[PDB]
Amino acid sequence: AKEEIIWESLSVDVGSQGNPGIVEYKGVDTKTGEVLFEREPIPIGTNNMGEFLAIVHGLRYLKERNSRKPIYSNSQTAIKWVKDKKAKSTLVRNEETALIWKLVDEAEEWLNTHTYETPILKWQTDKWGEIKADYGR
Amino acid sequence: AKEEIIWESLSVDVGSQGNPGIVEYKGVDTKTGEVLFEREPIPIGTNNMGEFLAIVHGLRYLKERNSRKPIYSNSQTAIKWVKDKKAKSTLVRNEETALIWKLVDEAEEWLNTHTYETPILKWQTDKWGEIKADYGR
DNA sequence: CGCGAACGCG
DNA sequence: CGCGAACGCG
């Protein structure tokens, strides 16, 4: 069904700046923009770990709800990480990063222990504007 | 002393092709081309590990001999690895790669346990022709 | 600015 | 061919 954007979907995005640094994420209804989940800032993470977590949160939220809506992300790498079931982060493992790493590790565990059919789709910023979940400037 | 090439030097190079695969290296007098050391093929290694080993061999040979000749390599990465005292190879550690990894590990150990002043210089192929130590096509 | 995906040489 | 160095996004 050749319609560009699937509006009945979930858009997820990460909020950063200084990287590694504080990270937060959320999931919004693409069509309506309403926020369907959000994670308060985590003092130390990376953009890509935050976005990885946002997509796996998204999967788990939709799964809970039985819903067939796809998820959109503008991140080539977080999408790849989810599809690979492996978050290939370079972030050091130490006391300050323990929390983000625990969440990422558990997110990976989730992926490798559950089935899902949610399409994870690349949001095309250069044609469709900012992702609705953008924090972000 | 602005003379382009230092002919009274040692040129080192690796022989490959299929990578990872069989690797060998040698050290030659740059001016004369005479081979001053050579390592018989190692069934499994990488180009960059082979060249790393060639440079550290070169350092140890010259050091033995008290000699002030520099060493030339055409490899940006092996030169960086030696200068960093860390061979950042992606080669898997398994039974078939154990030997090359043992040699690399011991080469690193050498570097971090000995002093040397041998300049390690980048051979400029695009201006000075093939490195004399080239196997290599 | 960093995070990560994506030329020479043999 | 692989080995390794060296754009979008927030």
Tell me the two tokens of residue B32. Answer: 């004369």
Q: Which domains does chain B have, with CATH numbers?
A: 1-137 (3.30.420.10)
Q: Which helix (H) or strand (E) holds B136?
A: none
User: DSSP characters for B79-109?
Assistant: HHHHHHT--------SGGGHHHHHHHHHHHH
Closest nucleotide to B80's CA, by C1' atom? D5
Closest nucleotide to B89's CA, by C1' atom? D4
Nucleic acid strand C within 7 Å of A80 CB = yes
Which DSSP category does B132 fall into? T
Burial label for B134, CB within 10 Å (0-12, 13-18, 19+), is middle
Q: Which helix (H) or strand (E) holds A48?
A: helix A47-64
Closest nucleotide to A79's CA, by C1' atom? C5
Q: How far is the CA of A22 from the C1' of C2 (A)?
A: 13
Cα(B131)–Cα(A10) distance, rounded to whole angstroms? 57
Virtual CA dihedral for B85, B91, B96, B100, nearest 10 degrees? -20
Cα(A20)–Cα(A37) distance, rounded to whole angstroms? 23
| Cβ neighbours of residue A26 closer than 8 Å, sequence gap 6 or more | A12, A13, A15, A35, A37, A38, A39, A54, A133, A135
Nucleic acid strand C within 7 Å of A76 CB = yes
Nucleic acid strand C within 7 Å of B94 CB = no
Long-range CB contacts (< 8 A, 24+ apart) of B54-58? B54/B12, B54/B13, B54/B14, B54/B25, B54/B26, B54/B27, B54/B78, B54/B133, B55/B12, B55/B79, B55/B82, B55/B120, B56/B82, B56/B107, B56/B110, B56/B111, B57/B12, B57/B25, B57/B27, B58/B10, B58/B12, B58/B27, B58/B118
Question: Strand A120-122 and strand B10-15: pairing?
Answer: unpaired
First to last CA, chain A: 34
Virtual CA dihedral for B5, B9, B11, B12, nearest 10 degrees? -140
Q: Which helix (H) or strand (E) holds B114?
A: none
Nucleic strand D interface residues, CB < 7 Å: A 13-19, 47, 74-75, 77, 123, 125-126, 130-131, 134-137; B 16, 18-20, 46-49, 76-77, 80-81, 88-91
- Number of other residues whose CB lies within 10 A of the CB of residue B128: 13
Tokens 């960059």 identify what position? B48
Cα(B30)–Cα(B6) distance, rounded to whole angstroms? 9
Question: Strand A10-15 and strand A71-73: pairing?
Answer: parallel
Q: How far is the CA of B118 from the C1' of C8 (A)?
A: 24
Q: How far is the CA of A108 from the C1' of C5 (A)?
A: 19
